[PDB]
UniProtKB/Swiss-Prot annotation, chain A:
Subunit structure: Oligomeric complex that consists of at least the alpha, beta, beta', gamma, delta, epsilon and zeta subunits. Interacts with the ESCRT-0 subunit VPS27. Interacts with KEI1 (via C-terminal region).
Highest taxon listed in the record's lineage: Eukaryota
More about this protein: Present with 15200 molecules/cell in log phase SD medium.
Gene that this sequence comes from: COP1
Protein name stated in the entry: Coatomer subunit alpha
Full-protein residues shown: 900 to 1201 of 1201
Location(s), subcellular: Cytoplasm; Golgi apparatus membrane; Cytoplasmic vesicle, COPI-coated vesicle membrane
Stated role: The coatomer is a cytosolic protein complex that binds to dilysine motifs and reversibly associates with Golgi non-clathrin-coated vesicles, which further mediate biosynthetic protein transport from the ER, via the Golgi up to the trans Golgi network. Coatomer complex is required for budding from Golgi membranes, and is essential for the retrograde Golgi-to-ER transport of dilysine-tagged proteins.
From Swiss-Prot, chain B:
Coiled-coil regions listed in the entry: none
GO aspect biological process, one term: vesicle coating
GO cellular component labels: COPI vesicle coat; Golgi membrane
Protein name: Coatomer subunit epsilon
Function: The coatomer is a cytosolic protein complex that binds to dilysine motifs and reversibly associates with Golgi non-clathrin-coated vesicles, which further mediate biosynthetic protein transport from the ER, via the Golgi up to the trans Golgi network. The coatomer complex is required for budding from Golgi membranes, and is essential for the retrograde Golgi-to-ER transport of dilysine-tagged proteins.
PANTHER family found in the cross-reference section: COATOMER SUBUNIT EPSILON
Keyword Protein transport: yes
Keyword field contains Transport: yes
Family: Belongs to the COPE family.
Note: Present with 23100 molecules/cell in log phase SD medium.
Amino acid sequence: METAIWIKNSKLPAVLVAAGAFDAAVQALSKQVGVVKLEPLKKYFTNIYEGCRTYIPSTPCELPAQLGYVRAYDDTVSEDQILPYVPGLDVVNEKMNEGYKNFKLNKPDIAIECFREAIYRITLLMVDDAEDEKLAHKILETAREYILGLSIELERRSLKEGNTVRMLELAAYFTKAKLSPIHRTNALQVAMSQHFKHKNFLQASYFAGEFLKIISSGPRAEQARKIKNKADSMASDAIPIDFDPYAKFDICAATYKPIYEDTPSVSDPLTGSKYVITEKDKIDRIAMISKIGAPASGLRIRV
Amino acid sequence: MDYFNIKQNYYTGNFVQCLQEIEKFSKVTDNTLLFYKAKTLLALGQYQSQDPTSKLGKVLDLYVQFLDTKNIEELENLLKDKQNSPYELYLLATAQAILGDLDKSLETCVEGIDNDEAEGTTELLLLAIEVALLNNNVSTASTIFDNYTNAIEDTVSGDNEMILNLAESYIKFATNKETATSNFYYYEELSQTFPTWKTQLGLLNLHLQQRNIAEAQGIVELLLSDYYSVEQKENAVLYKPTFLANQITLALMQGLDTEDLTNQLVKLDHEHAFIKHHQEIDAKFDELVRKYD
């Protein structure tokens, strides 16, 4: 009687999951976002499904409880536009914040785990205003940009002595991660130093500088200054890197080599991460959910 | 009317009092009196089969022994094939339904409702409507209800009226009709007039119902408050599962990890609705993992 009015009223992922149509839902997400690995998406179906049903007790208590559905709208509404209740950005935001919390706390691994939960929640989000669909995307964008940024620094950390060439490469790419500036600081600082413990003032003066142009005065800031000086006194090329600040490119989210406009690239239908043609039809490294390259009709969330 | 007190105290959840309202009828053996005595007794610290003599109270003994297993053997056996009272039936249908035989459970109910008020009928009626809804036959639940209502419009509501509203309530809960309006005032009042888990928990659902997590939250910290989680140890442990259930469905509306630490209790404890489903659903998903590897 109930569940149906939902499906009849909206055929989107969220609602499908909510109404109990998991096959129908998996299908929709392949076509629209090319989702392929269903595993890290289990608890989200569960949460969606369970989150709109509650149980009232039934008189002789030792008799199974009674189901009740939580609708997303009150009495006064198109007796058509009847739909299940579903989390909303309210939370997506909440979660995103924990990412930032952990970013500041220097707990990379955890930060990532957050962002993904955000990405997953967006994927199965359901919205009222065309407007919020817009924001859902802005959040979604940002997320990958943080998973990316972190994914890099994280791997720059998993490097053995001698790979020096590669390390400065990554440290400077991390800088490319479109994060809120304030957060990009930590990146810039990382780059700034490692291109000093390695006589590379031809970029050190750059990073330290690109840093000072956001952070005015603080303990850390003061070092960045002193670094731009002792560095602006010897245009050194101690170690040549692929990275050139003055150009337009994106960082491949699998390799961490840059992708210039000349480069043949492949995107991911959900995330938007870009990779080298090398890795087409593989699982994206941002939110290990969808197939890179596969074509999607587009992520549906507006009701 | 007569013992409208005993009834109004049963369907509200304070067996504590419900019992003392029957104590008042100093040993006047009436089937209705027995039913409710037995039932409140079960609802409390402990039941005491009062007489295995009554081809009714002898049933109750069975019913309870039933509850400690899943064999409707002697129960259904020492009853079927001989026409009997709705009160007797009531217990059977329940038994049956606790097993999952809902289609039959409801049948059992209607069979009794068919002795048209031969004492206990309204009690069955509710049960039928419940059993119906358990199986998702809202259509029928209503029909059964509707057709009994507009039927006995002979102001027979001598007290069963509150048993009746209870039924209606459960129906309204499923329909989701007047969830915000009239159906909210119903519980609202009930809670204010009789503070118990039965009533407070009802209110709770109505709130989750209305997306009002704010108010819901309150109702929960309150149910945890010393007065309920401690002061009424009895008809508070009786409802722990269901409570937990709601704790979750609310914890979820705000997306809190708790989903586990919480239903961990319900899991390593009971196996009702929420868990019944949580199982089915968990399987359905792992079922799709097989299908797309």
